[PDB]
Design a binder for this molecule. Structure first.
Ligand SMILES: [Mn+2]
Ligand SMILES: [Mn+2]
Ligand SMILES: [Mn+2]
Ligand SMILES: [Mn+2]
Ligand SMILES: [Mn+2]
Ligand SMILES: [Mn+2]
Ligand SMILES: [Mn+2]
Ligand SMILES: [Mn+2]
Ligand code: NA
Ligand code: NA
Length: 326
DNA sequence: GTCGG
DNA sequence: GCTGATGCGCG
DNA sequence: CCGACCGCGCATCAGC
């Protein structure tokens, strides 16, 4: 946290451009500036010193100069006290409310958690669940709870079938002492790249996890990705655990290493790696790494036996999950 | 907003 | 009733 | 200067 003042303001500026300005590339530009400054090993003494980093241009060095001069930023003061901007920003904290719905609510005068209760009937299933667990979803998960969460899913999973393999990923796999949610990568030998039919795989795992009252709600469900809510079992009914976001992702077994690389993250690392893959003639997704043709068409998937195999393809020295929190 | 082309 | 553009989301 | 800026899964609903 050597430059947290600067990275905090860049993050709040990125969030402003996503939620209010609906400018995803200005959101991404600020996050990239913030991620690069988080990585810089000297305390930033001026915007000129920051402009030397890839991702920090004139306008950000200007905001850093103002921020170090005054301890504040005028642009952010305006945004915090703008009724629309701050109300839109607030609503996007509800899961299911993104920048479009937020702006439309505020245009209808719906602009506080109470207002969303009065108009519960204007929310889709996802939003209504995000309002229901609004506070719980902002609570972090101690790694101690994560470990009990991991033990419950792994046990239930192969109480459905021996051959399942469940890998908890996301920030937990990177050794985070606390996590935003639970991200679970799922595989099975009967579902590979050339597999057919099936897809009753995610459902039986989800259904089993519901049958033991671990999953409590569903945000979305498909044959490869599940998004929902879970909860650690209440200790003899004594101040229940917060409800938690869980994501389960079912990847073909022969594609496990691309899948685990993607789901381990972090998101900015994934974006940095895939960009770097692009320069060296590759395209990385959660299934394959494919070579880039002369034109722009992607080639056939390359053989992958390890997370490191992908790093070498793109001439990146392997970085362990702990070192992936970009 | 940024920076490579 | 249908669907594909749009929205929201995952790392 | 100018435009590209990772990659993809699922749900909703305007316009038929
Ligand atoms: Mn009100
Ligand atoms: Mn997560
Ligand atoms: Mn997640
Ligand atoms: Mn029951
Ligand atoms: Mn995330
Ligand atoms: Mn590079
Ligand atoms: Mn459709
Ligand atoms: Mn421009
Ligand atoms: Na720079
Ligand atoms: Na949201």
């Amino acid at each position: 946290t050597l430059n947290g003042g600067i990275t905090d303001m860049l993050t709040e500026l990125a969030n402003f451009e996503k939620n209010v300005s609906q400018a995803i590339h200005k959101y991404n530009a600020y996050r990239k500036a913030a991620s690069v400054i988080a990585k810089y090993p000297h305390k930033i003494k001026s915007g000129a010193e920051a402009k030397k980093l890839p991702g920090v241009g004139t306008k950000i060095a200007e905001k850093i100069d103002e921020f170090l001069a005054t301890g504040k930023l005028r642009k952010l003061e305006k945004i915090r006290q703008d009724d629309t901007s701050s109300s839109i920003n607030f609503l996007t904290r509800v899961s299911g409310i993104g920048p479009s719905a937020a702006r439309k609510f505020v245009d209808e005068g719906i602009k506080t958690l109470e207002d969303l209760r009065k108009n519960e009937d204007k929310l889709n299933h996802h939003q209504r669940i995000g309002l229901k667990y609004f506070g719980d979803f902002e609570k972090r998960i101690p790694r101690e709870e994560m470990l009990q969460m991991q033990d419950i899913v792994l046990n239930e999973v192969k109480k459905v079938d021996s051959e399942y393999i469940a890998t908890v990923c996301g920030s937990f796999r990177r050794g985070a002492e606390s996590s935003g949610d639970m991200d679970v990568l799922l595989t099975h030998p009967s579902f590979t790249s050339e597999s057919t039919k099936q897809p009753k795989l995610l459902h039986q795992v989800v259904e089993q996890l519901q049958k033991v009252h671990f999953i409590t709600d569903t945000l979305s469900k498909g044959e490869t990705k599940f998004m929902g809510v879970c909860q650690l079992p209440s200790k003899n009914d004594e101040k229940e655990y917060p409800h938690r976001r869980i994501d389960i992702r079912l990847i073909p077994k022969d594609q496990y290493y691309c899948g685990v690389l993607y789901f381990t993250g972090s998101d900015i690392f994934n974006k940095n790696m895939r960009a770097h893959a692009l320069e060296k003639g590759f395209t990385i997704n959660e299934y394959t790494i494919r070579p880039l043709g002369v034109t722009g068409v992607a080639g056939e998937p390359l053989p992958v036996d390890s997370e490191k195999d992908i790093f070498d393809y793109i001439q990146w020295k392997y970085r362990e999950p702990k070192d992936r929190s970009e």
